Ligand binder design. Structure first.
Ligand SMILES: CC(=O)Nc1ccc2c(c1)CCCC2=O
Length: 119
């Protein structure tokens, strides 16, 4: 029933994601010199360095807010890819499966802790 425990749990999960080879296209903002049409397709850029900085600045209130921004990294990959068989999109789907498998208990414990607080 620790209402604050999600923050260290999310720091440790971001560390694992940075060690994963599948995260490399997603660690920093998409390079507009490499992809000059990117902002014609994607209205809200997101990347794992921006997620980690927002967490360490104390600018997330809950793990649900962090989860929304990580899911935006993956939806941006699906929208920008020219093929569902592309190398970079294929990496995004493995990373998404890994993320979803690990964040489920983080979300469950936080929501249980808050219900107990408000009982
Ligand atoms: C398939 C292909 O040739 N290119 C491709 C696909 C997806 C993505 C990128 C390039 C770069 C930006 C991030 C992203 O998700």
């Amino acid at each position: 029933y620790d209402i604050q425990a999600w923050k260290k749990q999310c720091e440790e999960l971001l560390n694992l994601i940075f060690q994963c080879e599948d995260s490399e296209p997603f660690r920093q903002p998409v390079d507009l010199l490499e992809y000059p049409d990117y902002r014609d397709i994607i209205d809200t850029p997101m990347d794992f360095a921006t997620v980690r900085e927002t967490l360490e600045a104390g600018n997330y209130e809950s793990p649900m807010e962090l989860c929304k921004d990580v899911r935006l990294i993956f939806s941006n990959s699906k929208a920008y890819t020219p093929s569902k068989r592309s190398r970079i999109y294929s990496m995004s789907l493995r990373l998404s499966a890994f993320f979803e498998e690990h964040i489920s208990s983080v979300l469950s414990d936080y929501k249980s802790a808050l219900r107990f607080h408000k009982r």
